[PDB]
Symmetry: C3
């Protein structure tokens, strides 16, 4: 049993092997030959091809996947027992993103030891672009300049700068998906077309992630060829500390507080019954294959009605990801702080909207998480190549992210139980 | 019976209420606080968001709606009794547009009391763009410059300026719609795809028109905050006079003359039999819901064969709109004259082609008339925000436009009767 | 029998009539009136409209036709007897393109009697664009510049210059076609959509080629209005000599050598049995209507198993075109040499990749060959209007190109016979 193991375990092993081979070839190149500025650009060329292929695919991905995500979510949601679960999912994902932003701008890993009305108005001017083909490559930006023919007079001009407009595409695909989902039968050809387009785009994302380790080997080798002071590793350690304390105070202080103020019962006697599901979600690292274990730990080990467990858990296994959203907020602001750049408050809200609204179009392919980390890095215009310093860390944080996703939608079945106590008697009587 | 009335009547009431609340808040703001140049730009911001949302939707609208319009018109047209009706519709729509252009450049409302070969050649260079994705945001423009190493030597250069190319998209969607309509069975998937895309785009146009009154309230308030001399209201009165005399000499002098030179019978004894249909089209303001009344006033109150009435009236209720085309020509040249701008003769023919060829893709949603008024304002590059001064007037001219649409296709059943007298005996004998 | 002949023969007759009427009107205009620089630009205006319409159509053509070509080729290929035919087709098409490039840069018709690493790296940077909508109009270009705060220090910058990116669209449509062809049943709506889009694009190419002779009449008239020295006709004669010697040493020296080193039998006793098929492919000038004649000349006049002839000949009649690929390579480098331009080695490999990979999406419409000659002229950014000087020659080289296409796929049935001798006994035993 040798080729079977490397058949089943090739993502984690190729990522770890690429990290260690890249670090050892960077050390063996640096302490044996000094490279100039030109040949440090030809050495990090497979990484350039990988960071081009990752940006090539995000446009049909965030069109087709967002359209089918919101159409299938509209199809699944039925009564007023399917509204409360969606509201719960999106409130806790927003709370997780806000906690991650507060923690990453308070701890500050990565820093070494004009009005704010125009940003908040360009945030709304970019949700409704003036052209829909041009939204696939250029954004808006307004600038307050001074007109002169005792007080100053001002005038606002606008210019279309380069870079994709993820907020306008997210908003238009949300509205278009709701419209073609509620059209019924006359817009079933559109749902079929965008569903097959989403499948064919997830397969190309899997092809790119088959190429990926040969790219991040050269990117890691080219990112320790300029190192001198042993100091970027402390920035990585502080980023791990920020993500782990964000998950540790999101799954202890916030979610049991939500359970206590809604249900008015003890959250820890609830969460002690989910121990098999949480240890399983740590061991197998996916929150959709630990679904039967959390089925038999909520209907049996607690006392939850199956009529709500048959809805909340299969929906929340795909669209309720608190830990991934907190991770993407913390990682985007950490990449911004690593490049000697201070974000505004239009950029923080763009990160905070693109991190929770990219949970809707979540199929079930765990590779595309990396593509989501490019999308929130490309909604605000940050250089994507520094995401290499996240991927080398990403195999040590996936376990706890899966644990917090499972804990969020396992608390959801307790939340939606108390709110919908009339409708369960209505489905019991008739 | 109170909430039922405001349920059935909410378009006219929200438009009128937005107009009067905008005028009273502009008067109450102007005579109580003086605003600078900067805070006159933040006051007209919901209007900016509305004029962005109106431009966001015109590209999938004029692609999908033109394709399904010309494909369904090709499907409906059968023999040589279905050719004459289409030729009649397009000749009278062109005559109405030409009469509107002549009247608006002769009366001139809105004015206060390089060769012309290169424009006419850019008009043909813009019907066949050199790229089809770039036609969704940029147009061509040629400039005759002078080369110098006794008579002058010249040379033509070309540059792609910004702004959508409505003429190239209209021509390509007309040819593409005819091709996939005549392909039969192998191109039925394309007709289904673009038909569902047209439905899903009309629903987003209805969503935008649900937002509209909150936008035109602030646009009207921001357009009487710069007023001083009581003079733009006289320009509005002259625009109403031009549209009403255009309809009054199109439905008295031109259409009865066409009837007299084709049929050689009295047009007024014909039109006196359509009195119930004309008063109905005034009372209910839509020319597709007054269709049974004009059915029973042409087959009964006159003497028209039903074999031509069953074709001409259901087709001409959607694609034969003379009054709307005259209105859009007069309103586009009035918006050009209001902004101290003299149009050329390439721009007048672009207005005159986009006004009659946007009657083909007419589904049956009466909101999208406003979107058509943006399209002819965006084929020639005029600022769209001044269309606010049309919308406040638009509830006083819709009745007479519906009356002239009904009168045009009611004269059509008399026209096509005399021309096709052999084919009716051929359908009677066999 | 007069109108029947001009019904069946209108492509060759309109091309020849346009050539002779254009030459006689250029001679009658030049020796009777001298034109300035400005009115030499209005005389060649229908040619400008034709060269705009030819560029308008290449984007949906190379998207939809490449997708359906590689999906249908994936569907047809079954066992290991369908792999060897595809490998044979693409190796001989590459050998033909390489022979054409060597012959055209060695003979040099058309000439009158920065690193090369950055070009070869932009060749790979253009196969994976950073945006997919922007790949429909702009390409990448890197430039090695010098940074200055004894040896020089350099730094590579990049800029997106204008012009369509045929290499990125070809690579993405190849990967997308393979993915939606191997998805099976869940991506059949995509195969149907792109198949109907390919049919509707071939019909618009036939409409443009109905317009074509009125365009090339004025282009030929405007290209002999600047002639003085009788010297461009010698360049045309040398281009004919280069294409004819390329076909003459591709169908005598290379293809019988491939047959001799694979089959180890005499190629001329094989090719003497194909005499009826070769004379037929000369007389009727299409290699897909001479298919039954080469069916009955390989299974009967030789001794080829029908189980391989029923696969190799219907596939190789559409995707195996050696003579057309050699012609397009020679013609693109000849158009480059005619405009006083020396190609690099990124541009020669772009021509050499776009010439063999545009044989995959080959439906069966013989007009679109001209559109392929624009595509390889637009992957490297050459002025397309000089393709007029190819079209006037193109009716004298089509016969021999059809002969070499038929000879290539007729040698293929002898090649694939010897390689697959085990599988034929496996299909005979069971
Ligand atoms: C905070 C707002 C949380 C609620 C958001 C969803 C609206 C509730 C609802 O009616 O859902 C059921 C409806 C349809 O249910 P229905 O058809 O039964 O009504 O479904 C949706 O609205 C689809 C999901 C839309 C999600 C939008 C997320 C935006 C995030 C921005 C940050
Ligand atoms: C280049 C050399 C890379 C070496 C990497 C070595 C480790 C990983 C190898 C995994 C291979 C394997 O067995 O996969 C099985 C997996 C299935 O494993 P699974 O069971 O996880 O699913 O196959 C796939 O995921 C499907 C992809 C098949 C193709 C794989 C090769 C792709 C090469 C990519 C080159 C660039 C393409 C650009 C595409 C976009 C262009 C527009
Ligand atoms: C003035 C020209 C008026 C005639 C235009 C339509 C052509 C007539 C015809 O054959 O119609 C039937 C044909 C098909 O009928 P058929 O298939 O029975 O032939 O239908 C069309 O041509 C579709 C409508 C095309 C309308 C183009 C409008 C252009 C306006 C520019 C200003
Ligand atoms: C303009 C005048 C051109 C005169 C050319 C005279 C010689 C060729 C005449 C051939 C006519 C014929 O019978 O064809 C039958 C052929 C069939 O012959 P077949 O048997 O070879 O197939 O019809 C077709 O191929 C279908 C096309 C029908 C339409 C033909 C006219 C097209 C006019 C084009 C103008 C520009 C259009 C731009 C389109 C793109 C816009 C986005
Ligand atoms: C904002 C507040 C606006 C207040 C306006 C008050 C008067 C009009 C209210 C009408 C409501 C109603 O009952 O409609 C029933 C009508 C049906 O009436 P009907 O019978 O005429 O059809 O519903 C619709 O037409 C469907 C639309 C439903 C959604 C309505 C709210 C839309 C909000 C738009 C915000 C911006 C969206 C941008 C979209 C594009 C983005 C890409
Ligand atoms: C030199 C390379 C020649 C071989 C190219 C095709 C690969 C062989 C193969 O597996 O084909 C069967 C496969 C599928 O067969 P399968 O599914 O039986 O495996 O088909 C293809 O690969 C489709 C054709 C792709 C052609 C790519 C051409 C690129 C040209 C660049 C210059
Ligand atoms: C840092 C901590 C203290 C933040 C606490 C946040 C809470 C105040 C939020 C988060 C989850 C929210 C709940 C999530 C879901 C719902 C269901 C929602 O929908 C319905 O019950 C009605 C649906 C219908 O019938 O239309 C009403 C609000 C409510 C109870 C929310 C009330 C406010 C809650 C408890
Ligand atoms: C300002 C006023 C005086 C303008 C007058 C315009 C008329 C001269 C036009 C407008 C309507 C036209 C008619 C509209 C429709 C048709 C049908 C059309 O098609 C057919 O009858 C033949 C169809 C076929 O069999 O192919 C022929 C032209 C005709 C009579 C047109 C002839 C010219 C008309 C009368
Ligand atoms: C200028 C001249 C001398 C160039 C000569 C070129 C040859 C060396 C090339 C061209 C055609 C090639 C052949 C084309 C097709 C095939 C089938 C190909 O596929 C298989 O037989 C295996 C398929 C499988 O089972 O997977 C193996 C290589 C081979 C024999 C190629 C071997 C190399 C050949 C003979
Ligand atoms: N393993 C965790 C756990 O199972 O919840 C967690 O899973 C992340 C995950 C799992 C499955 C699918 C996805 N997301 C997607 O496939 C995806 C695809 C497309 C988009 C889009 F928005 F369209 F760009 C966004 C997301 C993410 C993690 O790794 O952080
Ligand atoms: N009420 C009048 C009466 O019933 O004829 C008359 O109706 C205008 C009307 C009625 C119904 C539909 C439409 N037009 C559309 O929906 C439309 C939709 C799309 C386009 C496109 F060209 F594609 F942009 C053009 C028009 C216009 C008017 O209000 O002037
Ligand atoms: N007559 C020859 C003989 O029959 O092989 C030979 O035929 C060329 C021919 C014949 C049939 C179809 C095609 N090509 C196409 O239709 C085509 C269509 C699209 C593309 C694309 F790549 F998508 F742009 C490429 C090619 C070419 C020739 O004329 O040189």
């Amino acid at each position: 049993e040798w080729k079977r193991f490397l058949k089943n375990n090739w993502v984690l092993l190729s990522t770890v092997a690429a990290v260690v081979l890249g670090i050892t070839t960077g050390v063996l190149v640096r302490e044996h030959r000094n490279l100039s500025t030109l040949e440090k650009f030809y050495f990090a060329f497979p990484g350039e091809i990988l960071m081009r292929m990752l940006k090539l695919i995000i446009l049909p991905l965030i069109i087709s996947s967002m359209i089918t995500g919101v159409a299938a979510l509209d199809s699944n949601v039925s009564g007023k027992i399917g509204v409360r679960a969606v509201v719960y999912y999106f409130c806790t994902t927003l709370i997780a993103v806000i906690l991650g932003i507060v923690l990453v701008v308070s701890i500050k890993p990565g820093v070494t030891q004009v009005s704010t009305v125009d940003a908040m108005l360009d945030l709304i001017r970019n949700m409704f672009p003036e052209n829909l083909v041009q939204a696939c490559f250029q954004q808006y930006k307004t600038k307050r300049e001074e007109v002169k023919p005792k007080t100053k007079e001002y005038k606002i001009v606008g210019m279309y700068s380069d870079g994709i407009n993820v907020l306008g595409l997210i908003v238009f695909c949300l509205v278009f998906g709701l419209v073609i989902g509620k059209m019924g039968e006359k817009g079933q050809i559109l749902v079929d077309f965008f569903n097959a387009l989403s499948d064919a785009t997830m397969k190309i994302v899997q092809i790119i992630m088959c190429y990926m380790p040969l790219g991040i080997l050269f990117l890691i080798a080219g990112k320790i060829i300029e190192v001198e002071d042993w100091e970027i590793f402390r920035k990585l350690g502080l980023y791990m500390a920020t993500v782990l304390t964000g998950l540790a105070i999101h799954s202890i202080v916030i979610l049991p507080l939500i359970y206590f103020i809604v249900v008015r019962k003890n959250p820890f006697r609830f969460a002690m019954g989910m121990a098999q599901a949480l240890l399983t979600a740590l061991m197998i690292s996916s929150s959709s294959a630990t679904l039967p274990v959390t089925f038999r730990c909520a209907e049996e080990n607690n006392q939850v009605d199956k009529r709500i467990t048959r809805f909340v858990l299969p929906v929340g296994a795909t669209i309720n990801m608190d830990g991934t959203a907190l991770y993407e907020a913390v990682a985007a602001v950490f990449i911004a702080q690593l490049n000697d750049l201070d974000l505004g408050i239009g950029q923080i809200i763009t990160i905070s909207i693109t991190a929770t609204s990219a949970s809707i179009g979540a199929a079930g392919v765990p590779q595309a998480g990396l593509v989501t980390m490019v999308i929130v890095l490309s909604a605000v215009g940050l250089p994507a190549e520094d995401v290499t310093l996240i991927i080398a860390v990403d195999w040590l944080l996936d376990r706890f992210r899966t644990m917090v996703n499972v804990l969020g939608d396992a608390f959801g079945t307790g939340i939606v139980e108390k709110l919908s106590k009339k409708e369960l008697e209505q489905m019991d009587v008739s």
